[PDB]
Amino acid sequence: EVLITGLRTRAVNVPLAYPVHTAVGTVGTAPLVLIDLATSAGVVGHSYLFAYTPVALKSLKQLLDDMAAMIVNEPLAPVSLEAMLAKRFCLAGYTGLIRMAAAGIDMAAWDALGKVHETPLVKLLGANARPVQAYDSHSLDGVKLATERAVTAAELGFRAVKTKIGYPALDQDLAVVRSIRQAVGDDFGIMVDYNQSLDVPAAIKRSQALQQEGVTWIEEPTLQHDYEGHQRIQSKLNVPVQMGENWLGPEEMFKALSIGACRLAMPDAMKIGGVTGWIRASALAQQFGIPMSSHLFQEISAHLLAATPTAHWLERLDLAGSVIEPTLTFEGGNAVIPDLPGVGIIWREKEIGKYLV
Amino acid sequence: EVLITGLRTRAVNVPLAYPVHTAVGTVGTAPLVLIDLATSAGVVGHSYLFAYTPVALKSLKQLLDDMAAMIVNEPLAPVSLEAMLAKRFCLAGYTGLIRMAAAGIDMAAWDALGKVHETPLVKLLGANARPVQAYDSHSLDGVKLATERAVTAAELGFRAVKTKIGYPALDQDLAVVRSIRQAVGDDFGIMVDYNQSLDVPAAIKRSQALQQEGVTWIEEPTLQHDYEGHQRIQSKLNVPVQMGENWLGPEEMFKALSIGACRLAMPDAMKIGGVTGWIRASALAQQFGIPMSSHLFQEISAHLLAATPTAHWLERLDLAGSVIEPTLTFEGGNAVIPDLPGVGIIWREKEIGKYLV
Amino acid sequence: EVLITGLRTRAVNVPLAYPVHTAVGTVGTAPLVLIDLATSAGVVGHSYLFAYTPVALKSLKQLLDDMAAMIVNEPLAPVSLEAMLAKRFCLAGYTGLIRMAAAGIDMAAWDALGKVHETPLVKLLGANARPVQAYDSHSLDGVKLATERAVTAAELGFRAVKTKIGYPALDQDLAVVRSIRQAVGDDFGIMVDYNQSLDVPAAIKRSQALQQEGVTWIEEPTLQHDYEGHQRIQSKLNVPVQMGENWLGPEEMFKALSIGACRLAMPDAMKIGGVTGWIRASALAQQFGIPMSSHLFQEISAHLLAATPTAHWLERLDLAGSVIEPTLTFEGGNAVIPDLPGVGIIWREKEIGKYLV
Amino acid sequence: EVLITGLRTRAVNVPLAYPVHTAVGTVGTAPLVLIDLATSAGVVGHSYLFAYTPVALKSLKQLLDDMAAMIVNEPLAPVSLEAMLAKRFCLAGYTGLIRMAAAGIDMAAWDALGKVHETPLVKLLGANARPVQAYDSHSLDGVKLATERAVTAAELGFRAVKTKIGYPALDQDLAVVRSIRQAVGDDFGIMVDYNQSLDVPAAIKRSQALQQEGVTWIEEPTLQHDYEGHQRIQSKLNVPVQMGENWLGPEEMFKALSIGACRLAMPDAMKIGGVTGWIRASALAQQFGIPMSSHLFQEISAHLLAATPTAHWLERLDLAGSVIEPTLTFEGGNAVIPDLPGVGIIWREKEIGKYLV
Ligand SMILES: [Mn+2]
Ligand SMILES: [Mn+2]
Ligand SMILES: [Mn+2]
Ligand SMILES: [Mn+2]
């Protein structure tokens, strides 16, 4: 009855404002693939994918363009679609860029389903919209810019900032954290992200020094696939180890939680498998007793976290603000879901033309 | 915007046809509580609860009548409602009859949400309706009636029957299974249910004899809360141990699966927490690699299993056929979801009057 | 030879004095079901059940009234009665309100057995009556009322108080504890109860701050059914984690202790299964090396703790003082068992009439 | 001193002869990406990647074309190159198609290093060339074609064949295996591959029936990422469970072996990380005591297995025979490494032109 009738993708390289420097490299612009899922009901689902590096952008668009043939004329039923894609990519490997593509189709299919029923996604999932506390995510900015960006986020009403660390010396990490604390006061949350840059001994040593400074969480201290190593670092800390942005699918989350790799989780709506994967991830975080935050995709994540039993923090990192209307607002540090069908993503069409690849 | 405006319950004691004798007692009629959830949108959600024994029926209705005050004027948002009920019954114990009541409200709220959007529940959950293979569930019937009921189920197109066993001697168990096999042939599925009647040594001994007869599964061989004991019986068998009808909430399922108590699961839509609990249970069964069947509530279960990644068997045991229209059909041994908004439960109002308590 | 000849129940809503505010809600009056178990020997056993919320009160009374038929004309033999009730509610679920009802019948049957033999319950169990140290249980009272109630309990001879915490900020929790310590001095016991209000990361952080203040124990820091999560919080603490008021039956206690969820236990005489369940719980606490305190039901608990090898503290929280004679006295902070047959509960019959529901 | 000076890729869709039907779909032609790595020494390294489905072919070529910029002008040092690529794709996810691309560059860099030193790859790795027993890999061919292909492989001197199974009924699986056994005699090896098509209960049941037929190994009975489920199936079998073709990198192999998912391993030279990943995988298989076979890429695998301490079987499945010279020969069922520098891959340039995409 409602059928998918086409898939259109556009690759853009959009401006950010502050380039995201991390201890393992910098993301200077955002390579995005914008997705339009057309249906027989005359509504169009919208989603976007983040490619991380320009190197992977045209490959990801091509992959989505070659996948269009297997979903056109299929019923608009995201759970059934995801099972069929998992089976088609059985031999190839349903992970990495293929899983990320399948997740972009899922998020557009759920946006289209919300539009068919004229209801915001959070209400289609069975939950009430509620404000979700958000932290402002900044990068490896050095002492002066990290303190300036934190004072600005506090002025805009945010009650927490995430900074990236992993400087050559531990003293530089601490200098950044101390200067932020001094500027914003003892009540503000300061999350820190090591971006997989330390080995386990180094991560135990640096994390115990940061713990004595009072940070909110320590994110991906070592290689993301090393769940055992994260369990070893967590076992030496009172402060929670945070991870999850790199789990590809709920099945990778299940492995990390099964061995106790972290006390907090922050799945990425794209890498976890879209809305379909997020619902599954949410059920696992509830049983393992893990507070669950989001990673990027703040527009759909404000919806997904209101339906998440252990919802913790929303991450504000506006990757797509240049090409979409600002329907998601932040009031007093909380994200407020727009009262629009589906996810509430509306393209600024003449801005897209400027950034097209 | 859509609000719950009232809750009405009616207690009935309805005729079955074949009384359900089990190795621990007989269920001779069905004590049901019929639930009507009224909304500000002019649609009415419908569900029913099964009380198991007449002894618990008026208590369950009273409990639902006294809970009406906390849900009237709340938004029709089942996930948000369930979180609020879990918190209200925090101290009292969110399990047993209270959890069963909360699950009846959930199943009616999701039926009402399907009606507001004029869509079958399975499509609101994001899946396509598909036929689900079903087995016909019979009871501790002795050799002659168990063989007669199995020949009739095969004539109606079912490809599997469940019989109850746990007779004084193992020889009687085997006599029942052999006589069914002889009547229906080697291709037919014969599930057997011990209904918690054996201790662990006895269950290992009897199950290894039944395994040599070729049964499909062995269900609740010992006390249902003894997950460790079920793991000990399963470790001695090739045939799968089946359980799950008695898990109250996904959190009890999570404990049993975490220690490997069974190779199959069959949650009960009421005891697991309604549609909201079933979605969570489905995500856990997928990660633990457990084929998931249903227990009773065949009308909503045909919908829930089409959205369940490891869906296995639907149980046909028509408890409420006397008071609801036969919109769920079985064609060639498969259940076919009706093309009706919500769950498709329509009361036969003048039959209800005959069975009212 | 002695037979149960009738069961009578009365639902009352009795005044407390200080309403019990907790971090998850308030209990402003006590919904109780008073039970009279009549026997062929002309003695009447007495017990009461606590319903926690008015919402569950008439349901619990109805349940007990409908169960009367299965115990009338049965021998007054509590262990045999409990096995028969466990088997009857096999399919329904022998937990929650059904288990709580079965436990009220058990406690009345043991009171009646003490009366038939004209001996206090503790001596029928094979033990000597001894004074049991008791703590006074208060609630989420804020700094000024929590300090006032603690000074009064010290003036009445108690050497320990329990306060409830879980305020929006950790600073408020600590303010309450510090102000009590200042008022009562460093020798007094200050137990704190979080009433399941924190998630695991939050509970580790707050408990390590309270541990540096010197509290006696930290009670139910997170969701009561999450034994694994309590083991994770306990593993980070020197101070003991306390729990057990919500275990329904010794079999739930056995699961929590098997994974090391707590260093202290406090079973509830009703939820644990009455006197029959308490004897079983006591044997488990002795082998796992767990000091065992009680939760509510101070009249029967003074008897049960004198027969408990690891007896630790009795909880004073007088729920039923309005409708029963004060035969249990507290002298110098210890409860003194009355020298009366059975449990020593004597109804104040004209006060009951005032609170009847 | 030797520098990489360019990277050229060509996408082809080459003929197979027998289409590879599996229980989860068919591979009817082979989508390959041919890679030419040019160096400052005037030698050109050659490798190819297998894309599994036409859907992923142009995406994989594009990805390799966009990666060329990060390796041109880098020293021809495969171990150093792999560490630098792992770090560059840190955030994006060093798995799936990105890992497969990085592995194609690795295999071409090692072919080029063998050419610079004018020595076969196996001798550059420090080992002697030796004949490696090989099995002929066939597909889901039905009874008559599976028996015909097995008689032909025995006539060509192979002593073992792999057939694919996972037919609707277990009886069909057994019919295929029995008919092959009858044709080739009891001394011949018959490997069977389920291609992830069964759930765990079904896989235990079918594998124990095949074990009584005498097969050499049972390959990927269930979902490849479910290591725990493979450990559960292996624990019920005497026959070895085989897996490994889908491990992306030695770190996924390490997780599967750490929990005992299989008694045999067969890494894929592309998915495992090329020659660099294979050397690491070989060291892990030796310590865990796992006989190690190969998956596809028979040209480089004959070299890699002669340097593998637990080398077991080489898989013959000639994907690229149409576009490369037959320098790898099979004599009496064993693969014989050519006496050529590097890997011995020489393009048939005018055949490539026919299959170019
Ligand atoms: Mn991060
Ligand atoms: Mn059953
Ligand atoms: Mn408490
Ligand atoms: Mn294979």
Q: Please, are residues A266 and A245 in contact by the beta-carbon 8 Å criterion?
A: yes
A245 marked among binding-site residues: yes
CA of C106 to the centre of ligand 3 (A): 23
Touching chains, C (3+ CB pairs < 8 A):
A, B
Please tell me the distance from the alpha carbon of residue D171 to that of residue C242, in angstroms, as a whole number: 57
For tokens 């779909």, the residue is D25
Backbone angles phi, psi at A163, to 5 degrees: -115, 155
For tokens 């059934």, the residue is A80
Question: How far from chain centre, in Å, is Cα B218?
Answer: 17
Helix B274-288, helix B78-88: angle, nearest 10: 90
* CATH at B252: 3.20.20.120
Q: Please, are residues B148 and B136 in contact by the beta-carbon 8 Å criterion?
A: no
Q: How far apart are the first and last CA of chain D?
A: 35
- Least Cα distance to B285 among B306, B315, B256 occurs for B256
E strand map for D101-256: 132-137, 160-164, 189-193, 218-219, 241-243
CA of A162 to the centre of ligand 1 (A): 9
Pairing mode, strands A132-137 and C218-219 = unpaired
- Is there a single domain that holds both residue C160 and residue C177? yes
Question: Would an 8 Å CB–CB cutoff place A231 in contact with chain D?
Answer: no
Contacts for B167-171 with beta carbons within 8 Å, 24 or more apart? B167/B23, B167/B140, B170/B205, B170/B206, B170/B209
- Is there a single domain that holds both residue B50 and residue B178? no
- Least Cα distance to B124 among B109, B113, B136 occurs for B113
Q: What single DSSP character describes residue B240?
A: P
User: Chain C residues with CB inside 8 Å of B95's CB?
Assistant: 95-96, 248
- Least Cα distance to B117 among B340, B299, B306, B279 occurs for B340
A226 marked among binding-site residues: no
Please state, as a whole number, how many other Cβ atoms lie within 10 Å of the Cβ of residue D230: 26
- Is there a single domain that holds both residue C21 and residue C137? no
Q: Is there a contact between B310 and D199 if contact means CB atoms under 8 Å apart?
A: yes
User: Residue C136 is encoded by which pair of tokens?
Assistant: 């006074």
Helix B250-258, helix B227-234: angle, nearest 10: 40
Smallest Cα distance from B136 to chain C, Å: 19
Q: Which are the catalytic amino acids of B?
A: 164, 295
Domains identified in chain C, total number: 2
For tokens 């029923």, the residue is A117
- Least Cα distance to C220 among C169, C269, C150, C268 occurs for C268
User: Chain B residues with CB inside 8 Å of C56's CB?
Assistant: 63, 66, 92, 98
Question: What size, in residues, is chain B?
Answer: 357
Question: Would an 8 Å CB–CB cutoff place C236 in contact with chain A?
Answer: yes
Residues 6+ apart with CB under 8 A from C188: C150, C154, C159, C160, C161, C180, C181
- Is there a single domain that holds both residue A133 and residue A113? no
Question: What size, in residues, is chain C?
Answer: 357
User: Chain A residues with CB inside 8 Å of B307's CB?
Assistant: 79
- Is there a single domain that holds both residue A35 and residue A73? yes
- Least Cα distance to D314 among D132, D41, D95 occurs for D132
For tokens 């608009």, the residue is A76
Please tell me the distance from the alpha carbon of residue D321 to that of residue A284, in angstroms, as a whole number: 47
Please tell me the distance from the alpha carbon of residue D100 to that of residue B184, in angstroms, as a whole number: 52
- Any idea what the Cα angle at residue A281 is, between residues A280 and A284, rounded to 5°? 90
**Amino acid code (one letter) for C262:** C
C111 marked among binding-site residues: no
Annotate A151-193 with DSSP letters as a single string: HHHHHTT-SEEEEE---SSHHHHHHHHHHHHHHH-TTSEEEEE
- Is there a single domain that holds both residue C294 and residue C331? yes
Please tell me the distance from the alpha carbon of residue A244 to that of residue A223, in angstroms, as a whole number: 12
Q: Please, are residues A177 and A206 in contact by the beta-carbon 8 Å criterion?
A: no
Q: Is there a contact between C201 and A263 if contact means CB atoms under 8 Å apart?
A: yes
Backbone angles phi, psi at D267, to 5 degrees: -55, 150
Host H or E run for residue B350: helix B349-355
- Is there a single domain that holds both residue B294 and residue B164? yes
* CATH at B34: 3.30.390.10
Please tell me the distance from the alpha carbon of residue B86 to that of residue B71, in angstroms, as a whole number: 13
Q: Please, are residues B284 and A287 in contact by the beta-carbon 8 Å criterion?
A: yes
Please tell me the distance from the alpha carbon of residue A249 to that of residue A280, in angstroms, as a whole number: 9
CA-to-CA dists, residue B28 to B16, B17, B192, B319, angstroms:
7, 9, 20, 11
For tokens 């950044």, the residue is A176
CA-to-CA dists, residue B5 to A8, A175, B64, B342, C158, angstroms:
44, 58, 15, 18, 50
SS3 content of chain B, % helix, strand, coil (to 5): 40, 20, 40
Smallest Cα distance from C59 to chain B, Å: 5
Dihedral of CA atoms A215, A221, A227, A232 in degrees, nearest 10, equals -70
Interface test with B, best of D196, D197, D204 (most B CBs within 10 A): D204
Smallest Cα distance from A204 to chain C, Å: 16
Q: How far apart are the first and last CA of chain B?
A: 35
Three-state SS at C68: helix
**Amino acid code (one letter) for B307:** A
- Least Cα distance to D188 among D213, D211, D228, D158 occurs for D158
User: Residue C356 is encoded by which pair of tokens?
Assistant: 């009847």
Touching chains, D (3+ CB pairs < 8 A):
A, B
Closest-CA residue of chain B to D169: B187
Host H or E run for residue C133: strand C132-137
User: Residue D117 is encoded by which pair of tokens?
Assistant: 């030193």
Find residue D337's DSSP bridge partners.
none
Q: What's the reported resolution, in angstroms, to a tenth?
A: 1.9
Annotate D235-281 with DSSP letters as a single string: TT-SSPEEE-TT--SHHHHHHHHHTT--SEE--BTTTTTHHHHHHHH
Count of H-run helices and E-run strands, chain D: 12, 14
> Rg (Cα) of chain C, in Å, rounded?
20
Considering only the beta carbons, identify the residue of D92, D195, D225 that sits closest to A56: D92
Report the greatest alpha carbon distance in chain B: 62
Positive or negative, the CA dihedral C1, C7, C8, C10 is: positive
Find residue A163's DSSP bridge partners.
A192
Taking the CA of B91 as reference, the closest ligand is: 3
- Any idea what the Cα angle at residue A49 is, between residues A47 and A51, rounded to 5°? 165
- Least Cα distance to C139 among C181, C195, C96, C81 occurs for C195
Residues D80-98 as b or e (16 or more Cβ within 10 Å = b): ebbeebeebbbbbbbbbbb
Determination technique used: X-ray
Host H or E run for residue D41: none
Considering only the beta carbons, identify the residue of B276, B287, B307 that sits closest to A126: B276
- Any idea what the Cα angle at residue C275 is, between residues C273 and C278, rounded to 5°? 70
- Is there a single domain that holds both residue D51 and residue D142? no
- Is there a single domain that holds both residue D98 and residue D138? no
Where in the sequence is the domain holding D38, given as residue range(s)?
A: 1-118+349-356
Please tell me the distance from the alpha carbon of residue A88 to that of residue A92, in angstroms, as a whole number: 8
Positive or negative, the CA dihedral A180, A182, A184, A190 is: positive
Closest-CA residue of chain D to A195: D91
Question: Would an 8 Å CB–CB cutoff place D82 in contact with chain B?
Answer: no
Three-state SS at B136: strand
Pure H helices in B195-348? 200-211, 227-234, 250-258, 274-288, 298-306
- Is there a single domain that holds both residue C342 and residue C248? yes
User: Residue D137 is encoded by which pair of tokens?
Assistant: 């890999």
- Is there a single domain that holds both residue B110 and residue B195? no
Q: Please, are residues B91 and C140 in contact by the beta-carbon 8 Å criterion?
A: no
CA-to-CA dists, residue C204 to A238, B293, C96, C139, angstroms:
7, 39, 29, 22
Find residue C38's DSSP bridge partners.
C6, C44
- Is there a single domain that holds both residue A83 and residue A142? no
From C164, C230, C271, C303, active-site residue: C164
Please state, as a whole number, how many other Cβ atoms lie within 10 Å of the Cβ of residue D354: 12
Three-state SS at A270: coil
Three-state SS at B154: helix
Question: What size, in residues, is chain A?
Answer: 357
User: Residue A2 is encoded by which pair of tokens?
Assistant: 């409602």
